[PDB]
Paper text:
SIT1 belongs to the SLC6 gene family of amino acid and amine transporters, and the larger Neurotransmitter Sodium Symporter (NSS) superfamily. As with the homologous ACE2-B0AT1 complex, the structure is a dimer of heterodimers where homodimerization of ACE2 is mediated primarily by its neck domain while the ACE2 and transporter subunits interact via three distinct sets of contacts.
This movement between open and closed conformations occurs as a 30° rigid-body rotation around a hinge at residues 612-617 in the loop between peptidase and collectrin-like domains. Accordingly, the glycan density is weaker in this conformation as the chain becomes more mobile. This suggests that the Asn690 glycan chain acts as a latch on the peptidase domain, stabilizing the open conformation and thereby regulating its change between conformations. SIT1 is in an occluded conformation with the active site inaccessible to both the cytoplasm and extracellular space. Within the SIT1 binding site are two non-protein densities, identified as pipecolate and chloride based on size, local chemistry, and similarity to structures of other LeuT-fold transporters. As a sodium and chloride coupled co-transporter, SIT1 has obvious binding sites for two sodium and one chloride ion. The density for the Cl- is clear in the experimental Coulombic potential map. Therefore, we propose this structure captures the sodium, chloride, and substrate-bound inward-facing occluded state of SIT1’s reaction cycle.
Author numbering:
A (entry chain B), C (entry chain A): 603 to 738
B (entry chain A): 62 to 399
The structure:
């Protein structure tokens, strides 16, 4: 293949793609996705990372809203984010740990935006519906 | 003066290097040991060349930042107010809460912010030097001025100073609380709705830039303002008191208690009066002990009661300097810094 | 009165007191209020301030989690917070504007922690229940 694509990078494997459907889960009375909503989303992701690193690895890492880098924002509200080290951009948290962190605190992220597991798709993290307990 | 000071400093440093040949572990003479301690302190010579240069650079930078600190209106950056003129007048005369607040915050945001990183580096370097001189911290090096060892009953440890100061301030606190309550109550009437009767005093309402002195608050806290304070300046003017007889009166006061007279050359070499505009000289009242029985006073003395008291203060300094003239030059100083 | 209290300050009028009751609104399955929860709360408050300054005053101000200063934290989870300028501590947003911002986006703050207007009391901002519409 002759040429190159300006979208592939050696660290692009670590990106996690988020797709948000505001007007399907809420219908009317649905807020618009401006920069403040992106700030809140990055804060929620950083909070989830903090919770995972505190409750599993027993490490206190001060993540922030600037450590969740977001790209490829589109009107569907579907972007790619990756979480780096607190003050060291060259270090990227591996995607497995980020997926575990999202799984641990997905309910809180869902509640922060009033979305339920179908309008907030992380495209690689699939929810579990729950076993259907049987009568005696 | 720069050449003379440099020569003196070089001589002091080389003599400090030479003094290391006599350790204190074998000196049995108290006076000799004290002179050895005075001439043996390495000071800043114990750090490396890079560290010493960095320390001098940051010290000079902080001094220049404090000296050149100016508050400028963003509307017109050309016009600025310095610390000594105007800004002190704003903090010591204005009765406007907002104006005093602006002056205080501007001074502490234009100078303090520029000094914070330099001060962090200064703390680290001073700690390094003190540890290099067998001191736990630079504060211990400062407290060492009151250290006494090897003198029975008179020994004093560097850690004892902190406890003594705290114990003394605990006894001072009852008086300070009442003074603070009275000052707060009196200030409630001059800055209403800003001074809570249950809380503390805002920092910019203490008559001075930093709150170090409450003197400028006197006009707002005088107990009985209808009774004038004791002033004798006009009495001095009526009796034609020049800046030559007040020093004679102070000398008579000193001799009345048995202290000796003044030296013959003191009056001739002194500058008890301002030299006018022809000769440029400083005006801070200072006492100079040049040595070999040469004691002088420099003062742009006016005709004022405060000038009389300052002359008495400088004559006290002069008498103290004269008292220990027979002592070795290394011992020609007070018992401590106070 | 002789003496002084170490809790009064000229800027203490601008503080807003928050009282949180986790174990009453949730009973069981209630998370603990660690530092990550405080970080999320400050992020939510900053988001509310951004929304208010964007949708009312038409000013884009980049608030952050460091611009919501919090003090007097206690085991009841009741503290005092005030919001300052984005990069200028000496400037404090007046309490009226902060109250308006909280009123505008109180539902989002409630949803972020799964609390409902009774377990998250701002002690000065009272909610409105809603008019009881009458039959014909
Ligand atoms: C911000 O985050 C970034 C992350 O993005 C971070 O950058 C990293 O920093 C660490 C710490 O300094 C770096 O780790 C150093 O790497 C040096 C590079 O030399 C080595 O490079 C190869 C590394 O492979 C390792 O892992 C593989 C798989 O496990 C293993 O097989 C390797 O052996 C090695 O352990 C390695 O291939 C390479 O090989 C040399 O030797 C082989 C023979 O073994 C020879 O055949 C090769 O030709 C070559 O000569 C080499 O080993 C490395 O020098 C350095 O090691 C020194 O220090 C450690 C202690 O720290 C000693 O144990 C060691 O003996 C050396 O003295 C260390 O391993 C990492 O590479 C950075 N990554 C990037 C992308 O930059 C920043 O530091 C962060 N910044 C802040 C401020 O936090
Ligand atoms: C970070 O945030 C902080 C906020 O906390 C911010 O600090 C503020 O910065 C602004 C901008 O520089 C400051 O505003 C300046 O204030 C200067 C202070 O002098 C005035 O102080 C009193 C202010 O009262 C004002 O409001 C009242 C009520 O509306 C009104 O009555 C007053 O007239 C005045 O408008 C004022 O009382 C005082 O009075 C003087 O004059 C009276 C006669 O009128 C006399 O009787 C007094 O004795 C006294 O001499 C004085 O007016 C002020 O100098 C300055 O004004 C200059 O610039 C403006 C343009 O900016 C010109 O219009 C004006 O003519 C002057 O040239 C300006 O008003 C504010 O005080 C700061 N507050 C604090 C707490 O520090 C920082 O800047 C922020 N930092 C960053 C990086 O963003
Ligand atoms: C410590 O040394 C000093 C200095 O020698 C002694 O003080 C006197 O100093 C003068 C002038 O230098 C000498 O002429 C005397 O011989 C010194 N001794 C006396 C007794 O006058 C001081 O006495 C010494 N201290 C002790 C304890 O011997
Ligand atoms: C001063 O420095 C020298 C070496 O530079 C060292 O031997 C000595 O112990 C230090 N202290 C004193 C008091 O001389
Ligand atoms: C002391 O000095 C004053 C003036 O300086 C002089 O009048 C007085 O005579 C002197 N004392 C003696 C004993 O001469
Ligand atoms: C689905 O299963 C996971 C574990 O596999 C569990 O944590 C999650 O709560 C389940 N979802 C339910 C019960 O709704
Ligand atoms: C209560 O009233 C306010 C306006 O006063 C309104 O915004 C709010 O939604 C009301 N609460 C309801 C309808 O539950």
């Amino acid at each position: 293949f002759v040429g190159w694509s300006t979208d592939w990078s050696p660290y692009a494997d670590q990106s996690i793609k988020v797709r948000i459907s505001l007007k399907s889960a809420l219908g009317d009375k649905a807020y618009e996705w401006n920069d403040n909503e992106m700030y809140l989303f990055r804060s929620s992701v950083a909070y989830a990372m903090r919770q995972y690193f505190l409750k599993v690895k027993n490490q206190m890492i001060l993540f922030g809203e600037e450590d969740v880098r977001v790209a490829n924002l589109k009107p569907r509200i579907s972007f790619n984010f990756f979480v780096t080290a607190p003050k060291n951009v060259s270090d990227i948290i591996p995607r497995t740990e980020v997926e575990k962190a999202i799984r641990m605190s997905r309910s809180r992220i869902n509640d922060a935006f009033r979305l339920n597991d179908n309008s907030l798709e992380f495209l690689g993290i699939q929810p579990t519906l729950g076993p259907p307990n049987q009568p005696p | 003066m720069n050449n003379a000071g440099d020569k003196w400093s070089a001589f002091l440093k080389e003599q400090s290097t030479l003094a290391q040949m006599y350790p204190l572990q074998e000196i049995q003479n108290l006076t000799v040991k004290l002179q050895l301690q005075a001439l043996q302190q390495n000071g800043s010579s114990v750090l490396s060349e890079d560290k010493s240069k960095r320390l001098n650079t940051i010290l000079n930078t902080m001094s220049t930042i404090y000296s050149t600190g100016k508050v400028c209106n963003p509307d017109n950056p050309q016009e600025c107010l310095l610390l000594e003129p105007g800004l002190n007048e704003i903090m010591a005369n204005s009765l406007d809460y907002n104006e005093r607040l602006w002056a205080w915050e501007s001074w502490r945001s234009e100078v303090g912010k520029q000094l914070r990183p330099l001060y962090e580096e200064y703390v680290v370097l001073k700690n390094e030097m003190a540890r290099a001189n067998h001191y736990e911290d630079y504060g211990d090096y400062w407290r060492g001025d009151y250290e006494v060892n090897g003198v029975d009953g008179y020994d004093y440890s560097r850690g004892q100073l902190i406890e003594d100061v705290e114990h003394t301030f605990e006894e001072i606190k009852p008086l300070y609380e009442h003074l603070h309550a009275y000052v707060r109550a009196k200030l409630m009437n001059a800055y209403p709705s800003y001074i809570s009767p249950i809380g503390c005093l805002p920092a910019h309402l203490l008559g001075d830039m930093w709150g170090r002195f409450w003197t400028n608050l006197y006009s707002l806290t005088v107990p009985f303002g209808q009774k004038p304070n004791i002033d004798v300046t006009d009495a001095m003017v009526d009796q034609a008191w020049d800046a030559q007889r007040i020093f004679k009166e102070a000398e008579k006061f000193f001799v009345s208690v048995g202290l000796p007279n003044m030296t013959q050359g003191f009056w001739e070499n002194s500058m008890l009066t301002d030299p006018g505009n022809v000769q440029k000289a400083v005006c801070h009242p200072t006492a100079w002990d040049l040595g070999k029985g040469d004691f002088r006073i420099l003062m742009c003395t006016k005709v004022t009661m405060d000038d009389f008291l300052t002359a008495h203060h400088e004559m006290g300094h002069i008498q103290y300097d004269m008292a220990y003239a027979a002592q070795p030059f290394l011992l020609r100083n007070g018992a401590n810094e106070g």
